[PDB]
Symmetry: D3
Subunit: 153 residues, 6 copies
């Protein structure tokens, strides 16, 4: 419940892996002061993707979206810190890269919304759901950064 | 006329060359996913510069502008991609660097509007004219990036 | 004189601890701003109370002074056109949660009491801060080779 | 057996995670052209560590080494490519950072051998063993980078 | 004249494809070397056979020519003290497996037939290469503001 | 006399300042894990410079050297850590930048030996003398990095 212990789900999409952006994305979160909680590299099954995108099941683009997200591997992650959900979204930039400003991940590194390299949870509740979908609890690491008292009041 | 095949004219100005920013500027376009079409290094004639800046010929300190832009070599370039004209301008930042936001090229690397290191076309129509002014069609390279299908849907 | 405006920028104890001194300096150098003064020091509470005198009516004032006295800092002076206002823009909003990506605070820190860097908020406060942290002898005058490519 | 499909085990050690080097290390391998095969974030058990370091079981420093490696989380990874084992070791630099040259991971980012931020397999056979210790086969991802034919003859 | 030595450096098709043009240019700029000529072009096999004439006795010559004709390249000329020899050192060993971290090839590529960049191996071959790829009209003469801080 | 508390003198020379390398140089020391102890920006007197370069007073072009080092401001620094004198020199690279390897400071950023951007002490004994020459003891800051126990065993 503690503000500083909020968690979000960030995922490098197949285009982000293909284009060599995994390290650069992780570095953005590390240098900011956010704390890694979970990390893996996986080819997501259509089953998992259909759960992740379940709200979109009736949309005409849904099958193509699932097929695309199943067309190469992804890097799911969990990050922890104060307002990491909303601040994470800020760091990512607008969902449509056209509107993402320079300095943001999407603003610096991609062009078109269907190839927008990265996903971040849009709310605390959706983050909790996404974390539970993509990770089991034993994959979530609890640790204490040496720099903690220089990052947080 | 294909949206993804739009081209813009980007030029490193004499101060950008002098201050060692050519590579950094090209890198920003490459990492974004835009496609290089043309590139050269040249000392622009006053004649060419007067055509490029024709819109300013009846405004203050035109001979001064032309003389300054003829005082050192420049790096004219052509870049291709979806909305590259508008997005290019966004990447450059506001023309006056005090208004340019951090993260942008002008925002990060210069200070004063008459020493603002870079130019980008302001519209599709002016891009077509600028490209034709600074390059011959034989200098425009046709090629296909390996990563194309991870940049564009 | 316009191009000779100066501002006070200081890396805070958390900026030093988290290894951001060079990165911060690099941001001002690459922009075209000119270094005028630089040092590394543990600031006394007496000095810090003067530095933050404008905030003395605020509940967080003693905590700010105590915190800023908990590790060393890197006071600096930078010179150039509109460097106070532009400096503030480069630093980003005082509260990092509101600072945009691309700014120093937006890229490198999270919470306002650990916001890594200070910059003067106006020409007048810059003049005050520069005089507080430095002797005139420590302010170096010189001219960058690139000056005519930065200013007309 | 194919030369280009050789794999090695690279692990960010607890000090490397603590000091915010995970993204930077991954970026070194991505930018080189090597291909990510597996990635995770974990607190290694003493059981696993005693298997990883089994050859050292009789050494007087063994218990302290295991305790230290169990004192914070690590980032185990697998990378694929031509001579990735030996070239990986080259990229890491000498095991003792004192002897690691600038440009290498250890040369750029650490000081003392007991806090030397990273591990890489020292031979193809030891890599195969380490990969099997730290990962299961289902965690190893097979995929094809768009850039493959620009990285390999 | 010593400080006016020139070498030919070219980003190969794999360097262009993998988005390394700016990074390569930046390495020479930050070193203090001076850009003299730059372009982007698809090279003909006729040109490439002349460029690689020294290697015509080798079994890999036709494959090298064909490969170098498979995508566009970025030919360049750089100027400065011992730029041919120092350029080669910056590029790293021709075979990337032998190129050390810190060099262009050591940092950015893996296999010798995909080794991203070419640099002249001697003053004489540089003179030949510069004349092959550029007209004298394309070689720009100018003087960097920082010159006196790079050379005495 | 503690090994880990060794200190060296590092100075950005006038060309390093002029060419905008101060931050980059400091960053290389920070990222390595060395500890900043002292830092200033000053225009060095000929008197001070003659003491610093006393060993060269009977060698060619001494007045020229002194005049050049008095032609622009410098950034004197003190850094602390295990074998920081020797490792510092390794990080700087060979004194003549043509011999300095890529990855080193001189290797990456300069060309000619009399314009070689940086100085580092050549031994523990010369460091002690240089530190005492350029700084007062009151300017040497005592502090403890949060990451110390992840840098040193």
């Amino acid at each position: 419940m503690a503000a500083n212990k909020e968690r979000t789900f960030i995922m490098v999409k197949p285009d982000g892996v293909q284009r060599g952006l995994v390290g650069k994305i992780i570095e953005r979160f590390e240098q900011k002061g956010f704390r890694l909680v979970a990390l893996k590299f996986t080819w997501a099954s259509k089953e998992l993707l259909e759960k992740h995108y379940a709200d979109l099941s009736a949309r005409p683009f849904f099958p193509g979206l699932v097929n695309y997200m199943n067309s190469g591997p992804v890097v799911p992650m969990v990050w922890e810190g104060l307002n990491v959900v909303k601040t994470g979204r800020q760091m990512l930039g607008a969902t449509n890269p056209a509107d993402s400003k320079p300095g943001t991940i999407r603003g610096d590194f991609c062009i078109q919304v269907g190839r927008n390299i990265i996903h971040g949870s849009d709310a605390v509740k959706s983050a909790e759901k996404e974390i539970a979908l993509w990770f089991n609890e034993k994959e979530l690491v609890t640790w204490t950064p040496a720099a903690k008292d220089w990052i947080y009041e």
